[PDB]
Amino acid sequence: MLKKKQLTVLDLHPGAGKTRRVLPEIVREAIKTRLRTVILAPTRVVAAEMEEALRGLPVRYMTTNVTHSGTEIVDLMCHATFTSRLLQPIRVPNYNLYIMDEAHFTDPSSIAARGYISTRVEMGEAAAIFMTATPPGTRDAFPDSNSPIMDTEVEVPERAWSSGFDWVTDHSGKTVWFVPSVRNGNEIAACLTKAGKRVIQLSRKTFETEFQKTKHQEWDFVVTTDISEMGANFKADRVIDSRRCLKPVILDGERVILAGPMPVTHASAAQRRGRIGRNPNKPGDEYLYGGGCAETDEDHAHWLEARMLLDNIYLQDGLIASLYRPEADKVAAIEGEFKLRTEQRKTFVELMKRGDLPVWLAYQVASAGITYTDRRWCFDGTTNNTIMEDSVPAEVWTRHGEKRVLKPRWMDARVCSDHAALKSFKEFAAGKR
């Protein structure tokens, strides 16, 4: 059963073998029946794990080993690559079958991809399989696992501590710890180091290049933000979960703020817990969690950002894809209201890719008719848009040979929320990329 007008949700529990056992079964059938197929991985790390599982099968990897093949049937790329080529003039094949792994990923690109795909199925042109243990709207934070898990609600620290949390360091196994922000992770990683622990810190931006150290290095703690929910694999016996995240929120339609950490969805909680309990020979991995879950995530900027991407993907004349139905009421918008014309869309795409700016911010710049390399907007905003570093106004040497205070016309706190984010924006403002 692969060629019909239907979207299948494959929702086996974490570790049941969606990526390693089921996926190759589908690819083999799609190859056999000559079905133009795309496989969508959330990250390059998952893409490499798919390659091990798919070795032997004719798959065209559109990901950074590629050897020429006369078989053109199954493509594999990241969610974000898929959506990006759909925004670009580059021609994306009209696949008969879409296979989305980790189809709960809530990056705006993944959300937009699911909207595009569900619209193609809804119109009779394709089939689709969404692989995820935690489909949108699940209220089960404690699904089944391969091995029994010990769940404990505790007070989870979010700052350095002197006393009160001895159970954290009095543990000899390996721990994955989900923190509410990169800054909080830094402060916690320094406390754990002080106590004689070996700590690796991961975030979404560093995940691709630094996750590999968790396999070629000795560690006691992985201190990380929510990137590791989707398909990160550690050999850990314990997960510590604050169950909270900073959330980017559009305030008064004019700016994005990072709103003070707010509980995660049951799906996120389930996915974090799902990093352990995966080995049937090891009962009693521990899931220690800091608070409750909430499904009130409509204030997250990524729902509107997904509409901004989807308004810019052509399907047929006068038709704009809707969000995947379980995600469609998360955002109030006018369909098409973010559609840019051809040259501004180009700028939008390039501000998001080489510029490395959040979708919301790239949209403000592109739709103002600013070209990609014109950085005068990073300095000409209102004084409440002044970016601080070490409690003083940040400054850069501009491409016009002047020292200017960083003061963007549109303010998005995600570009100055941590040291790495701000360094990156400072180089963008100076014209260095």
Q: Which residues bind Mn ion (CB under 5 A)?
A: 18-19
Distance set, CA 239 to CA 102, 178, 295, 354 (Å): 20, 8, 22, 35
Applying CB under 6 A, among 2, 8, 20, 295 the residue interacting with ligand ADP is 20
**Shortest distance (Å) from residue 269 CB to ligand ADP:** 16
Torsion of CA 379, 384, 385, 388, to 10 degrees: 100
422 DSSP 8-state letter = H
Residue 48 touching ligand ADP (CB under 6 A): no
Residue 19 touching ligand ADP (CB under 6 A): yes
Strand residues in 65-194 grouped as ranges (E): 74-78, 97-101, 127-131, 149-153, 175-178
CA atoms of 299 and 406, how far apart (whole Å): 27
Binding window for ligand ADP (CB under 6 A); candidates: 17-25, 186-194, 318-326, 408-416 = 17-25
**Shortest distance (Å) from residue 17 CB to ligand ADP:** 4
Residue 15 touching ligand ADP (CB under 6 A): yes
**x/- contact string, 129-148, with ligand ADP (CB under 6 A)?**
-----------------x--
Residue 14 touching ligand ADP (CB under 6 A): yes
**x/- contact string, 269-288, with ligand ADP (CB under 6 A)?**
---------xx---------
Binding window for ligand ADP (CB under 6 A); candidates: 11-19, 105-113, 166-174, 318-326 = 11-19
**Shortest distance (Å) from residue 11 CB to Mn ion:** 11
Distance set, CA 192 to CA 166, 219, 222 (Å): 11, 11, 11
3-state secondary structure of 424: helix
Identity of the amino acid at 5: K
227 DSSP 8-state letter = G
Q: Which helix (H) or strand (E) holds 393?
A: strand 392-393
Applying CB under 6 A, among 8, 11, 12, 29 the residue interacting with ligand ADP is 12
27 DSSP 8-state letter = H
Applying CB under 6 A, among 233, 322, 398, 417 the residue interacting with ligand ADP is 233
- Rounded to 5 degrees, what are φ and ψ at 306? -65, -40
Q: How many residues bind ligand ADP (CB under 6 A)?
A: 12
Under the rule (CB under 6 A), what is the footprint of ligand ADP? 12, 14-20, 146, 233, 278-279
